[PDB]
Design a protein around this ligand. Structure first.
Ligand SMILES: CCCCCCCCCCCCCCCCC/C=C\C(=O)NCCCC[C@H](NC(=O)[C@]1(C)COC(c2ccccc2O)=N1)C(=O)O[C@H](C)CC(=O)N[C@H]1CCCCNC1=O
Lengths: 238, 277, 99, 192
């Protein structure tokens, strides 16, 4: 779903669109603060690619079986290729055009800019416990790049959302550089009789998307692969 | 005069949805149509096959089929290679003239966006000077393949004169036929005060040349305004000739129609009855 | 900019006569580009099953189309032709002229 | 040729209410459609409703539109606002006769303000369980008519509220959190 590449490499995204449909499948590019625009479409009846107005003929290409496994390869990537890429096709009735799942592409000048998050669970405030009888467990994933991270709360190893609340959009740690690396916050509300119970396990689970086993790493630092980093805390009787 | 030409229409509304049509014409009358479903020449009339043999027609089908696919599909990259703005249209017409008897007088022209763009002059594609450099760029492309131009030259110089020769003879009965007109009178949009508009419709006549005039006895009323000659589903023509006169001087006016089918017995209708009233 | 606007002409094959079948023609000519979408109307509403001739262009590269249908007039019936081109801010309606 | 614009970007409205998202377009087509799509935060596009060139005001479920064809203005009104409807909404148009592509607007994010039964805003402080002398200041139980805010300097980071998951009979409060690298660490004065 999420891909990371360095400037000059290639990226082949896949189109998981519902079954087979009309012959033409269009590829759209969506960027933050900008209107989505089609880049090209693939003619299955001719197995050929047609571009849009002002695109160089070597940048994009499309191939494969259109039934849920249509591919789109980008070559000679630059920084401005980052964004969510959709694949779309019209209905049989041409009433609406279906859109598949998005694929986020992140392009950075240096792969060294990719870092895993630093998770830390914070115990509720005793003053907050007073006159509320509710506990606020705050999780914090920080120092990660890119900005996509899946966070969840697990109690006793059972994934629970009933009570959770999470940030909708990560926050840049230094909004001056492009390669910035962001942080994400998430709270959790628990009754006083439940947090005061010291036999409850609270595991804030954080899922990070980074490099893969096929990528090459050239740093003494541990390779920031797509991994899971989690932090935990236990209840206090007093 | 008499000219057989084949037209070609290529409409490109956007990056999808391209339209393509091919038709043959005896200068007002469509005689052939192209079926894109099976890549065959549809004959609208039994005599439209001319004196060409059945095998000779098959080679024409393959020629037009191969020419169309290579031409109509190679446009798509050119619109991207060049700076073509959708929508755009390419029109081509080519044929030969019936000068005096027939024969010499072939032609072939192409138009981009409804304006004269390039033309084929007996071995080569000459751009129109007013068409600019893009015509010259596409004349370079068209003049490259000598084999196609040799086929095109033979198509305009040999096949067209030999075809129209048999096409006219085989279609002699249909073309020489005479159909009498049918006429009636009505009231028009009624111009400013004190003036009436008299309309004289003439309908269903073949061939095309017709004579119609509002008359007052023998005196032709030169205020008669003759409109366009409009077609019909059949090979017949419609024409209405109008005349504007003052209200008090409407009577004694008559519409007179002359046509070759009438054999000199002209149709005369009189502005009398509920018209006056 | 170099797009042309259509010339619309409506006429009947035979004199109007209530109860007698006739043919209504609408001649749309001299337009560019091709996307034209002409409709024949009876008492305002559209008419289905309308035949039309194959597309063609005259010598000045402008297209012309003939749209015709079979109909039987009545006293209260009104007929018109509706044309909708890119060169039209709104559809242009030309009415059949009876007495 | 074709242009579609949406003036505003961020819109908020309380739950169980109605808000309207506007859309202006400039087209040269006599036959076209108007589409509204809902972009989920998970980067997914879902069709909502279609409006035709010569169609009456479209209507389906909690969706309705106000079609001012004379000025080329179509506004999507979402009635009976729920919490799941909070997303980013786009309007686009395509050719009716020859459907090729969509010309999209720049987007209009809508966030729904939840119910507030009994408010009691306050600010609290938490410490890291690993205890590296790390701490955070939490401001919760704020009402929907408050700010979300932002400080100065470069350090001391603040968030912009939150929304809940499935949240089957959850607490349903508003949480804003901030933290710096200790030193000052004035929780009672940071949010002010
Ligand atoms: C209804 C059918 C049954 C009746 C039958 C009954 C009657 C029987 C007797 C009839 C005797 C008389 C026959 C007279 C011939 C009439 C000609 C009519 C149609 C015709 O030629 N079609 C094909 C031509 C289509 C256009 C084509 N346009 C191109 O191809 C490209 C390269 C594509 O975009 C452009 C272009 C774009 C924008 C602006 C300007 C441009 O120019 N130009 C073209 O000009 O094609 C030529 C003529 C053929 C040719 O040289 N081929 C080349 C093409 C180039 C690549 C190299 N290889 C080739 O194959």
């Amino acid at each position: 779903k999420s891909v990371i590449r360095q400037t000059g490499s290639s990226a082949e995204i896949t189109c998981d669109l519902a079954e087979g449909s009309t012959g033409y499948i269009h590829w759209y590019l969506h960027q933050e603060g900008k209107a989505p625009q089609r880049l090209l479409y693939y003619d299955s009846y001719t197995s050929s690619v047609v571009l849009e107005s002002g695109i160089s003929p070597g940048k994009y290409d499309t191939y494969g079986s259109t039934r849920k496994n249509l591919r789109m390869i980008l070559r000679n990537l630059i920084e401005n290729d980052s964004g969510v890429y959709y694949c779309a096709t019209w209905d049989g009735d041409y009433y609406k055009k279906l859109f598949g799942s998005g694929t986020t592409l992140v392009v950075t000048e240096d792969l060294k800019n990719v870092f895993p998050p630093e998770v830390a669970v914070f115990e509720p405030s005793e003053a907050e416990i007073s006159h509320t009888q509710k506990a606020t467990l705050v999780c914090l994933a920080t120092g990660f790049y890119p900005d996509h991270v899946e966070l969840s709360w697990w109690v006793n190893g059972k994934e629970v959302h009933s009570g959770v609340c999470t940030d909708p959009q990560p926050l840049k740690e230094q909004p001056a550089l492009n390669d910035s690396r962001y942080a994400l916050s998430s709270r959790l509300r628990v009754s006083a009789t439940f947090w005061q119970n010291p036999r409850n396990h609270f595991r804030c689970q954080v899922q990070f998307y980074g490099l893969s086993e096929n990528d090459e790493w050239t740093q003494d630092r541990a390779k920031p692969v797509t991994q899971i980093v989690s932090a935990e805390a236990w209840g206090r009787a007093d | 005069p008499l000219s057989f030409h084949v037209i070609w229409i290529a409409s490109f509304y956007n990056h999808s949805w391209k339209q393509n049509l091919v038709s043959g014409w005896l200068s007002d009358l469509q005689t052939h149509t192209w079926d894109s479903n099976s890549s065959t020449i549809v004959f609208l009339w039994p005599w439209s096959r001319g004196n060409f043999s059945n095998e000779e027609w098959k080679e024409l089908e393959t020629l037009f089929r191969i020419r169309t696919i290579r031409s109509f599909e190679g446009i798509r990259r050119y619109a991207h290679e060049l700076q073509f703005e959708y929508p755009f249209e390419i029109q081509v017409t080519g044929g030969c003239e019936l000068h005096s008897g027939k024969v010499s007088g072939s032609f072939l022209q192409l138009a981009y966006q409804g304006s004269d763009f390039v033309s084929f002059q007996n071995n080569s594609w000459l751009p129109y000077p007013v068409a600019g450099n893009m015509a010259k760029h596409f004349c370079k492309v068209l003049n490259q393949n000598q084999h196609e131009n040799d086929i095109t030259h033979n198509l305009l110089s040999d096949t067209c004169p030999r075809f129209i020769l048999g096409l006219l003879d085989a279609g002699k009965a249909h073309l020489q036929r005479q159909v009498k007109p049918e006429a009636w009178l009505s009231h028009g949009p009624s111009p400013g005060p004190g003036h009436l508009q008299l309309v004289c419709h003439v309908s269903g006549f073949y061939p095309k040349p017709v004579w119609v005039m509002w008359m007052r006895g023998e005196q032709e009323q030169q205020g008669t305004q003759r409109g366009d000659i409009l077609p019909s589903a059949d090979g017949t023509w419609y024409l209405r000739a109008t005349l504007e006169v003052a209200a008090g001087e409407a009577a004694d006016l008559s519409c007179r129609v002359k046509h070759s089918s009438l054999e000199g017995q002209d149709i005369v209708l009189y502005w009398e009855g509920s018209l006056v009233p | 900019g170099i797009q042309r606007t259509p010339k619309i002409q409506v006429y009947s094959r035979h004199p109007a006569e209530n109860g007698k079948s006739n043919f209504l023609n609408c001649y749309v000519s001299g337009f560019h580009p091709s996307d034209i979408e002409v409709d024949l109307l009876k008492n305002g509403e559209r008419i289905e099953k309308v035949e039309h001739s194959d597309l063609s262009f005259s010598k000045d590269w402008s297209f012309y189309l003939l749209y015709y249908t079979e109909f039987t007039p009545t006293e209260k019936d009104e007929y018109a032709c509706r044309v909708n081109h890119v060169t039209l801010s709104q559809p242009k309606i030309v009415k059949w002229d009876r007495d | 040729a074709q242009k579609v614009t949406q003036a505003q970007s961020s819109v908020s409205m309380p739950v169980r209410k109605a808000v309207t998202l506007n859309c202006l377009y400039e087209t040269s087509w006599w036959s076209y459609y108007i589409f509204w799509y809902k972009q989920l935060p998970s980067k997914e596009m879902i069709f909502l409703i279609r409006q035709g060139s010569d169609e009456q005001n479209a209507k389906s479920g909690r969706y309705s539109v106000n079609f001012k064809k004379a000025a080329k203005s179509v506004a999507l009104t979402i009635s009976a606002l729920q919490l799941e409807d909070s997303a980013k909404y786009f309007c686009a148009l395509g050719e009716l006769r020859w459907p090729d592509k969509l010309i999209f607007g720049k987007g209009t994010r809508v966030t729904v303000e939840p119910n507030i039964q009994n408010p009691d805003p306050a600010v609290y402080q938490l410490r890291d369980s690993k205890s590296s002398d790390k701490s955070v200041c939490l401001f919760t139980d704020f009402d929907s008519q408050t700010n979300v805010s932002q400080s100065k300097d470069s350090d001391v980071y603040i968030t912009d509220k939150c929304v809940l998951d499935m949240r089957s009979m959850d607490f349903k409060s508003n949480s804003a959190v901030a933290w710096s690298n200790k030193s000052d660490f004035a929780c009672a004065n940071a949010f002010n």
